[PDB]
């Protein structure tokens, strides 16, 4: 709960399976994985 | 913004009356104590005088060089500072400035070129400078007043061209000596604007 | 320069004059004679001529029969010749005593040389060379085109030379622009503004931030750029495992994907368009359909058809009104399936009877059947009534029997009648097909 910015610079690329077809175990987390968006918020969440 | 824009330069003969106006827009004119700093051509600044603020009395302090000759005033409702230059002599040929502070000069205005010369408007006496055997130049002796502009090959050659700042004789006239440096057969056209006397000069050794 | 030149030159009139013709340089340079020479080629099909009197006037007369620019210059005088060369003092140096030749700056264009050149005989002895040599203006215009110059603005009160600048490009592959100058007879700012307009049009860069400074105008919201939109869509390669779902067999089932089509091209209809339907309930569908039906150019007539009322009743009614340009079946809107049988849908029977009644009425007009979500362009909901698609079913067959009588079907959403008002007029009259 501290003022501490996280400024990550990435590129979209392509990791898992195309979200339209989803997956077997990675279904709701495919989105949360393939998004430079959460690639700065995930860090600010784990550390707080 | 504060802008001390000036007005009132010109050409007079020694012993005339000339007005110097300092238009102050941007600050409360009555709080500051405007001063007038003289800069004779190419030397250091010399302070002419300054009027105190109306609230500081309005006492005007002048130099030793111009006491009994110049008088300085100020108006708030018309918001102008005055340098009243009476009984001018040859020394007043200079760029007079108007600063907004007696001990703390601030905006300084722009620079009103006042000239006190006894000369009249005459064109140049274009005298060429033959090379020794080198550079090639040409005089513009005995012209008045300044403006003046000298080109070479009629504004074709600009590299090596040195238009020496002008020079005052004791007669009140001006003398520029513009010279190019290049091995060779060149032309110099001097255009004295106040009189519109364009003289051209072809030079050989 | 010009004042002293014109002043002295005012004496040579009576011996020689000037002319300006737009004849090709070939014939005139061939037929010139008796102290006559070309003062200035101003194009492959334009030459100014400086020749003595009583032959320069005949040159204009010959060009009047050549149906080409032929004007006896009322400002006629001596130039580009010997009658003015003799004055080696007044007409050669007195005109221009002071001069300040300029450097590169923005490339100017001299003509007596035929190329871009800035010598000392431009500020000084250009008039010496003007009253001596020709002008070869065309050569310099070719050099302008070679140095990338195409829009030519005629600084004058009448187009005489831009007219000729367009015969520069009447034989040149680099067709060039020559903004029409204020016409002979134009002398007001209305005509100057008309020129500034065609200057912008031709390609002349106008600093519009200078025309609008004295006006004291304001900037107001205007429509933005109308991007002319293509359809540049890239369909993905692995769409749902690069197939329908799990892999593929050698056989291939087809499918129906409703593609966004045109609403049709609206044509002002005529005659009448019958809003054929029931009468059981009051229908806002009718008021919404008709408001763009008599506005479609025709008139709107109701045709209350009852369940198995007869294969003929509608026929004699259609004949009673007269010639009809088509009919709007609104009997299949907001109507439940009789739970007795899906194919006993009241509308399907009346649609069939209406089709064969038009066939028997010899009316020959395309019938349109407005349906309420009988089908769907997309699964966003549940087909309001599968029985209604039955009409659609037979609809797709009706056209194979009677192309003139069958227009088609127009599905509209369940409950809302706005789509009717928005599109039916164009849809029924649509040339899209």
Q: How far is CA A28 from the centre of its chain?
A: 12
Distances (CA, A) of C172 to C49, C139, C146, C152, C319: 23, 12, 12, 15, 68
DSSP labels for C109-156? --STTSS----STTTTTHHHHHTTS---HHHHHHHHHHTT--B----S
Q: How far is CA B113 from the centre of its chain?
A: 4
* Residue A20 with chain C: CB contacts under 8 Å: 236, 239-240
Q: Which helix (H) or strand (E) element contains residue C369?
A: strand C367-372
Apex C233 CA angle, C228 and C234, nearest 5: 150
* Residue C244 with chain A: CB contacts under 8 Å: none
**Which residues have CB under 8 Å from B119's CB, separation 6+?**
B144, B145, B171, B172, B173
Give me A23's structure tokens. 């997956």
Which chains share 3+ C-beta pairs under 8 angstroms with A? C
Give me C273's structure tokens. 């368009």
Candidates C98, C103, C120; nearest CB to B198: C98
In this structure, what DSSP letter does residue C90 have? Answer: I
Measured in angstroms, the CA of A1 and the nearest CA of chain C are apart by 42
Method of structure determination: cryo-EM
Domain B3-116 carries which CATH code? 2.60.40.10
Dist. CA C163–CA C145, nearest whole Å: 17
Other C-beta atoms closer than 10 Å to the C-beta of B28 total 10
Dist. CA C168–CA B123, nearest whole Å: 49
| Residue contact A21–C236, C-beta within 8 A | no
| Residue contact B156–C123, C-beta within 8 A | no
Q: Which helix (H) or strand (E) element contains residue C199?
A: helix C189-202
Distances (CA, A) of C61 to C27, C64, C67, C159: 14, 5, 10, 21
B195 to chain C, any CB pair closer than 8 A? The answer is no
Contacts with A, C 229-258, CB within 8 Å:
236, 238-241
Q: How far is CA C365 from the centre of its chain?
A: 36
Dist. CA C168–CA B162, nearest whole Å: 47
Give me C343's structure tokens. 């194919």
Distances (CA, A) of C266 to C32, C207, C245, C262: 66, 43, 42, 11
* Chains B and A physically touch (3 or more Cβ atom pairs below 8 Å): no
In this structure, what DSSP letter does residue C4 have? Answer: H
Distances (CA, A) of C432 to B107, C262, C263, C378, C429: 76, 7, 8, 21, 9
Domain boundaries, chain B: 3-116, 127-203
Q: Which helix (H) or strand (E) element contains residue C331?
A: strand C326-332
C108 to chain B, any CB pair closer than 8 A? The answer is no
In this structure, what DSSP letter does residue C336 have? Answer: P
Contacts with C, B 133-172, CB within 8 Å:
151, 154-156, 158
C98 to chain B, any CB pair closer than 8 A? The answer is yes
The answer to whether B190 and B148 have CB atoms below 8 angstroms apart is yes
Of all residues in chain A, the one with the smallest CA distance to C244 is: A21
**Which residues have CB under 8 Å from B144's CB, separation 6+?**
B117, B119, B120, B121, B122, B172, B173, B174
Nearest to B23 by CA among B8, B40, B41, B3: B3
Identify the residue whose tokens are 């029924």.
C428
| Residue contact C101–B156, C-beta within 8 A | yes
**Which residues have CB under 8 Å from C218's CB, separation 6+?**
none
Three-state secondary structure string covering chain B: CCEEEEECCEEECCCCEEEEEEEEECCCCCCCCCEEEECCCCCCCEEEEEECCCCCCCCEEECCCCCCCEEEEEECCCCEEEEEEECCCHHHCEEEEEECCCCCCCCCCCCEEEEECCCCCECCCCCEECCCCCEEEEECCCEECCCCCEEECCCCECCCCEECCCCECCCCCECCEEEEECCCCEEEEEEECCCCEEEEEEECC
Please confirm whether the linkage preceding C188 is cis (ω < 30° from 0): no
CATH topology of domain B127-203: Immunoglobulin-like (2.60.40)
Burial label for C79, CB within 10 Å (0-12, 13-18, 19+), is: buried
Which chains share 3+ C-beta pairs under 8 angstroms with B? C
Query: What is the side-by-side order of every strand in the sheet holding B186-192?
Result: B150-152, B186-192, B197-203
* Residue A18 with chain C: CB contacts under 8 Å: 236, 238
Q: Which residues of C146-159 are buried (b: 16+ CB within 10 A; e: fewer)?
A: eeebbbbbbeeebb
Q: Which helix (H) or strand (E) element contains residue C428?
A: helix C418-428
Candidates B154, B158, B196; nearest CB to C120: B154
Which chains share 3+ C-beta pairs under 8 angstroms with C? A, B
CATH topology of domain C1-202: Malonyl-Coenzyme A Acyl Carrier Protein; domain 2 (3.40.366)
Resolution in A: 4.1
Identify the residue whose tokens are 């080109």.
B151
Backbone angles phi and psi of C361, in degrees to 5: -85, -5
* Residue C239 with chain A: CB contacts under 8 Å: 20
């Amino acid at each position: 709960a501290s003022p501490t910015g996280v400024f990550v610079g990435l590129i979209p690329q392509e990791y898992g399976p195309r979200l339209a077809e989803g997956g077997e175990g990675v279904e709701g987390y495919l989105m949360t994985g393939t998004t430079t968006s959460v690639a700065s918020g995930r860090i600010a969440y784990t550390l707080g | 913004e504060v802008q001390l824009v000036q007005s009132g330069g010109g050409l007079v003969q020694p012993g005339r009356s000339l007005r110097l106006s300092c238009t102050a827009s941007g600050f409360t004119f009555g709080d500051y104590a405007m001063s007038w700093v003289r800069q004779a051509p190419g030397k250091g600044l010399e302070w002419v005088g300054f009027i105190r603020s109306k609230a500081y009395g309005g006492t005007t302090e002048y130099a030793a060089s111009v006491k009994g000759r110049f008088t300085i005033s100020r108006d708030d409702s018309k918001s102008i500072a005055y340098l009243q230059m009476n009984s001018l002599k040859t020394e007043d040929t200079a760029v007079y400035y108007c600063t907004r502070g007696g001990t703390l000069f601030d905006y300084w205005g722009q620079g009103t070129l006042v000239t006190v010369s006894s000369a009249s408007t005459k064109g140049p006496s274009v005298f060429p400078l033959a090379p020794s055997s080198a550079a090639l130049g040409c005089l513009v002796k005995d012209y008045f007043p300044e403006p003046v502009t000298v080109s070479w090959n009629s504004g074709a050659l600009t590299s090596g061209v040195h238009t020496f700042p002008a020079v005052l004789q004791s007669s009140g006239l001006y003398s520029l000596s513009s010279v190019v440096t290049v091995p060779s057969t060149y032309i110099c056209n001097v255009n004295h604007k106040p009189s519109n006397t364009k003289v051209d000069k072809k030079v050989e050794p | 320069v010009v004042a002293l030149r014109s002043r002295v030159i005012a004496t040579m009139p009576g011996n020689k004059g000037m002319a300006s013709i737009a004849a090709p340089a070939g014939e005139v340079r061939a037929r010139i004679g008796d102290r006559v020479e070309i003062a200035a080629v101003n194009g492959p099909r334009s030459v100014v001529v400086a020749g003595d009197s009583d032959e320069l006037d005949r040159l204009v007369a010959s060009c009047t029969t050549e149906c080409i620019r032929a004007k006896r210059l009322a400002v006629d005088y001596a130039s580009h010749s010997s009658h003015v060369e003799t004055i080696r003092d007044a007409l050669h140096a007195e005109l221009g005593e002071d001069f300040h030749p300029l450097p590169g700056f923005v490339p100017f264009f001299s003509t007596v040389t035929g190329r871009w050149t800035q010598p000392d005989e431009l500020d000084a002895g250009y008039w010496y060379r003007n009253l001596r040599r020709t002008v070869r203006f065309a050569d310099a215009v070719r050099a302008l085109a070679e140095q990338g110059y195409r829009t030519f603005l005629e600084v004058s009160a009448h187009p005489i030379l831009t007219a000729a600048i367009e015969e520069i490009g009447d034989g040149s592959g680099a067709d060039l622009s020559a903004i029409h100058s204020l016409r002979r007879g134009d002398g007001s700012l209305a005509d100057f503004g008309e020129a500034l307009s065609r200057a912008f049009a031709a390609g002349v860069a106008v600093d519009w931030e200078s025309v609008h400074l004295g006006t004291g105008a304001r900037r107001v919201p205007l429509p933005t750029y109308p991007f002319q939109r293509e359809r540049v869509w890239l369909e993905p390669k692995p769409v749902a495992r690069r197939s329908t779902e799990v892999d593929e067999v050698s056989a291939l089932r087809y499918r129906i994907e409703w593609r966004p089509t045109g609403a049709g091209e609206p044509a002002r209809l005529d005659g009448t368009w019958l809003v054929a339907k029931y009468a059981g309930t009051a229908d806002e569908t009718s008021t919404a359909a008709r408001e763009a039906l008599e506005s479609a150019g025709a008139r709107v007539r109701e045709l209350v058809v009852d369940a198995r009322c007869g294969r003929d009743e509608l026929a004699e009614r259609l004949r009673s009104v007269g010639e009809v340009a088509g009919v709007l079946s609104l009997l299949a809107v907001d109507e439940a399936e009789p739970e007795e049988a899906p194919l006993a849908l009241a509308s399907l029977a009346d649609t069939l009877s209406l089709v064969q009644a038009m066939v028997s009425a010899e009316l020959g007009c395309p019938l349109w059947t407005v349906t309420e979500s009988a089908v769907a362009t997309g699964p966003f909901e549940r087909v309001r009534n599968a029985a209604h698609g039955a009409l659609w079913g037979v609809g797709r067959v009706i056209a194979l029997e009677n192309p003139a009588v069958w227009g088609g079907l127009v599905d509209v959403p369940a409950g809302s009648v706005a789509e009717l008002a928005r599109h039916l007029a164009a849809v029924v009259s649509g040339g899209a097909g």
